[PDB]
């Protein structure tokens, strides 16, 4: 059983624990605390009572930016990342948000392929943006159009 709900402040320790297990370049606790509040629309997915994934998204006017997403390694290939992204996308669409943006390490071919299947397009590349364990790698900035405009043609 999976449940998607708001990620609250008291959920941040559980999200931090996932981040340590899931990411090689993990966020610090202070970074997590910084990425919350009234501009955020943060979500968590819980499987059988345990947090399994989270997504941190800032919404500024009608544009949303995904700051971080992770799935706990005990829960990989179970569709949880998609489920959580689909939920986010749906909620953003309900709110009339125009675009969702994210940044991904160029070497993550699997995540890029998944994002493309959800409708994301490469917007731009940032050469050598990220550190690696060997040297540096590019960031791919991706964009997903969500909501349509409604004014259309004007008549008087």
Descriptive overview:
- It is a single chain.
- The protein is of the alpha+beta class.
- The chain has a single domain (1-156), classed as Aminopeptidase (3-Layer(aba) Sandwich), CATH 3.40.630.30.
- Helix content is 26%, strand content 37%.
- It has four helices and seven strands; from the N terminus they run βααβββαβαββ.
- Strands 1-2-3-4-5-7-6 form a seven-stranded mixed beta sheet.
- The longest helix is centred in the middle third of the chain and has 15 residues, at 80-94.
What is this entry, summarized?
The PDB classes it as transferase. The entry lists the keywords RimI, AcCoA, gnat, Structural Genomics, Center for Structural Genomics of Infectious Diseases, csgid, transferase. The protein has 156 residues and is an alpha+beta fold.
